[model samples]
Target: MVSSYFKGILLNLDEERIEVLENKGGIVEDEFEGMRYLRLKDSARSLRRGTVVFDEHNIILGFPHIKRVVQLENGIRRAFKRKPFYVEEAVDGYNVRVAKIGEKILVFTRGGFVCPFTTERIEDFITLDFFKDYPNMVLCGEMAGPESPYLVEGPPYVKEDIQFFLFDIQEKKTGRSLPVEERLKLAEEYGIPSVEVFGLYDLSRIDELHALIDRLTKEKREGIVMKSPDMKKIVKYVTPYANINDIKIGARIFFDLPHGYFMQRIKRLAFYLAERKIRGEEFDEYARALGKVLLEPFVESIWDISSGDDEIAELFTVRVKKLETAHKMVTHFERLRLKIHIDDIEVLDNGYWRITFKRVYPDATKEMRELWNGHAFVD
Candidate 1:
């Protein structure tokens, strides 16, 4: 299913200021529910064609996702290449069922739609199109710009904490959360950008904080989050600052595979399937038999290899199509009481199969790798 966008209410807004209070935990927010604030940058004053703003609290750029299909050299198209092509080819269609050339698969696009394969498809994949102007399209989660990085944080990081708070007296006068139901209300009340806050502060050490920010930015650090010295509860909605508070990093997710890793897996599976075909196994029994020997070790081993990051997740998936085509093999493993976890498998409209595994856990990672590299042999 497509992910949903979480909407937040703003507690206040103005050309120079804005605040947002989110309704859920997915997007950028102070406490997952507290007020997030952003002030304008002088750079935004220039609307030149290539003017790009960098901020710290929000992401200014991206991570990208792509999917594609390629074919085997043994297919009919390959028969025309060599006059004396004598290499034995697998007789079973599924034994070497890679997609034909030019097949289009659905993949995430820069526009956030899983667009069809058009002239815009990237490289050869029916995937998202990339342009230099949209580099931030790579970011999959929230991103904050340099000036307001805290306003657009990502999902929980390996190192960080999130706390909640409320707004107070000075912020109450900001009238940032005024809501609008129609154009007239929007014009009249000038509803705050969708944000909220539990508190506002006038830090006594503004100069020190700004100075520290300058140092951090130069070091390429993700930036710092400063919390109020006191915890107080205040509630209000305000119009968010259009440019500052609502800025998105255009986060996308990209997959980085270890060279030859995925190709090796595919080759290994193919070797086993070739053996089964030689044994004169029936298609259904062959699938079940191969499933028994391959799927368990394959799933468990991959889960172990990848540390569960999304990049690794993408790489692990490329082999699933081959695994599925060897259906009898997968069933064989299941009947033997071996556990296989593969919940994310679907057919792309383009005829290629997409297989996704959930995030890997630490224990699973260690044990599975040991089995593959040390003890288990496909033969």
Candidate 2:
């Protein structure tokens, strides 16, 4: 049975809820700290299926979701409100949590999987004489390298080998992350390389922080992660290049072959458009230059496919509940590209919505299906 709680009320999903649950890969049973816990594959899906339950303490029995860091603007606003926040270089890597539980040293990925690579690399370090004193503590940090499966763009410093950079320490039983000062000291004592800290400062020095990020971006570095002095708040600010890289990857997959390559170029142009929109920067001249790069190939592709008649085809569809953010984003994309049309949108029971879309080009639909089928797993 799928189980979740809203506010303090427990929910046991029956048949209808189970159907929504199935779409989310259902519930997976796992054990943590010697206690069994049920993990829902889609936390958002479970919320959409079950009763409207929004709580700060929302958690499974033995497992807890890792805290997500917000984007730059929101993160900065929140950090300013908190005051006395510490800035550290945000390393691009896999977030790994290492904990010593009942004589076993276990390393878990951000999503709570016992990763073999992470466990093997840090096994000896946890077994060192220094860790014997703090046996119940959990060390959290980024595991980065060219070899790391979750590596993003291969940050400059971590080119040859995998390295673990410690950033936070928590008592496994208490779930409280240590303050920055204490965490750094602990990392030093254990000979763990912690994330580089710029300095401690109040919100008044926000401009300096942005300048630092600009310099780091110029040097091909990821942005920064800021944390409050009390360790209660943490956030990340990624560079524009990093954001563009992610968009390019997604564009490559979503758009196909020559179109995929051109889509990347269009997205690069779009990134400048978005940046200009946000910052009021004079990147329009540069954007127009890049826009030309996007237009030429786009025109060529249109002419190449001109002989084929446009046919309507359903592009993609998904069932979602409660969370309207995904739906809104899709609608925004449809607005941006007039060729995309929302064929169906139906609100369902259990506070969910089914959203489906169609596009004018049948070839685009075929390409998307091929991409999906290519990625399908086989036993």
Candidate 3:
């Protein structure tokens, strides 16, 4: 039942090789509508990994990882040369792919899990006409907002619930997407919400590009994604604001993630500031801000533990259509051993189930215990 969509892009795989991959723990198997969808972990033959194959008919190619541009000026110049590129807002949010199956919309996270929150809330965010008109396509976008279940914080502009911003549209089976010019217009015709667009520019507009980055940083917004007209070459660059924010957040449960997590952000900020030849008072200002971001959140988290329970808790507030949806969301993180503490749950006036919960940071809890129990803090 190999479809025409897979005739070109489908990697050379027969039943036996796929079985070998499964046996080697390379593919994660899931069932939907009695159709098996196999997600690849790494490149198998010619198929770029992270691809999802549905019953040999629809193969949802995994979204390729976008590389972060270190030195924006030199990196962009080297990657695209003089090619005109489109600058799109790169919001700090969750990556979700919405696919139509039978009569329902399945919202998959970057890790390929169907998010219960987004699955239920899609109707409230975006119109379904695009999916109905182009039923065979998968919509790729970021699910971001203040009340998002997976994230503690989101874009300050989203004062209420979550919002979906379309960035790419891909064929279900072919995994091919339209270029930026076409994708933007298509999204526009459908009244689809999308990332902010700052118009097209080239290397000649480097000054303006730097100004754009400066503005976004000063405004405390995430940076931009630069894409070639054809969408072949895509890279992301962020503002110092994003780096400081990430550190501020992650430093709270520092032990929860790797050490380099904080180190990478500091390095990026250094490069950004160094690139502009920052000096004197400006350097002093950045130096103080960086030191403060590193010390503040972490100090607060320690106080959070000392003031409350031994557990370093990460708080989340979100709304679900039903109590069952909230429970299922809790279970999703449960398997990862995040102890869920539901602080409150209530029915909003709009009939949405608004729940507040915390995911205790186990690793951080243990480390904090050691430190508080008269142990040395030296690593």
Q: Of models 1 and 2, which has the larger TM-score?
A: 2
What's the CA error at residue 269 for candidate 3, in Å? Answer: 0.2
The local distance difference test score of model 3 is: 0.80
What would the per-residue lDDT of candidate 2 be over residues 176-244, giving only the tens digit for each residue?
788888888877777877788989866667668767866886776767777887778776666655554
lDDT of 2: 0.54
Q: Residue 363 in candidate 2 has what lDDT?
A: 60
RMSD of each: 28.1, 14.9, 3.6
lDDT of 2 at 28: 46
Write model 1 residue lDDT over 1-379, tens digit each, in one string.
1112112122111211221111221123211112222211112222211111122222221112211112222221332232221111011000000011113221222222121211122232211222222232221111112111022232122122211111111111121221112212322242211112212223333344334433433443322222222212111111111111111111111112235543443443344345324354444554464444434444544653654432222112322234443243234324434333355566666665554333223344444445545766574
lDDT tens per residue, model 3, 200-264: 98888888999999999877788999999888889999999999889888878888697589888
Highest TM-score, which number? 3
lDDT of 1 at 157: 22
Q: Per the 3 Å backbone cut-off, how many clashing residue pairs does candidate 2 have?
A: 1
What TM-score quantifies how close candidate 2 is to the native fold?
0.57
lDDT of each: 0.25, 0.54, 0.80
